[PDB]
């Protein structure tokens, strides 16, 4: 199974060390994989440039992505983005643009998207996702 950690859950994990997440990681089977979208990696790079110690931030990013590999798009992400961008246009931009790209990335991989406090994603009705901070 492909588990894609979104940007919010990574931020959460930098600020907290919660038991719920240890348990969920413990339940991971051997062929299961943790990844992040290129979107999220770009936001990480942005934090590094906005941080006091650029070289330390980049070092921490390299360690993180060695385990949580970055994935890059192919045509399928664009098909999903076109569909859901159109549907979501009527609903008053309920989902941020980078969150939407991330959701469509997960759709394109049939990944399960792991998030924290983005209930908006329920509007993308074919997205498989989980909040690994809640029960």
């Amino acid at each position: 199974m492909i588990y894609m950690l979104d940007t919010n859950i990574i931020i959460y994990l930098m600020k907290n060390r919660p038991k719920i997440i240890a348990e969920r990681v413990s339940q991971l089977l051997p062929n299961d994989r943790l990844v992040m979208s290129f979107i999220t990696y770009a936001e990480l790079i942005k934090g590094a440039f906005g941080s006091q110690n650029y070289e330390q931030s980049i070092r921490a990013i390299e360690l993180l992505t060695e385990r949580v590999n970055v994935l890059y798009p192919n045509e399928q992400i664009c098909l999903h983005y076109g569909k859901w961008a159109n549907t979501l246009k009527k609903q008053g931009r309920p989902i941020g643009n980078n969150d939407l790209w991330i959701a469509c990335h997960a759709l394109s991989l049939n990944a399960v998207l792991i998030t924290h406090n983005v209930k908006e994603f329920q509007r993308i009705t074919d997205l498989q996702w989980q909040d690994w901070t809640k029960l």
């Binding site: 930098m14 240890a22 990681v25 936001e43 590094a48 906005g50 931030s57 070092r59 921490a60």
Partner: protein, 70 residues
């Protein structure tokens, strides 16, 4: 068995671990047993390595990344 010291670290409390009781992990589970004793149980190797991946980021990094704007 031994004795060891409780002290303050920054704004929080801490306990010194004497050499003979050192941990090989950066994170332990802490809980309270039925008789009130406090227990420190190391997390697994898998869990420790995962959580370590997020420890290196300082508050200026988080503050900049927390500004998703989106």
């Amino acid at each position: 068995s031994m004795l060891t010291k409780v002290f303050q670290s920054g704004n929080s409390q801490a306990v010194r671990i004497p050499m003979d009781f050192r941990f090989d992990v950066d994170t332990v589970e802490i809980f309270r047993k039925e008789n009130g004793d406090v227990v420190l149980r190391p997390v697994s190797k898998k869990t420790d390595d995962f959580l370590a991946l997020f420890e290196g980021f300082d508050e200026t990094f988080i503050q900049a990344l927390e500004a998703r704007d989106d």
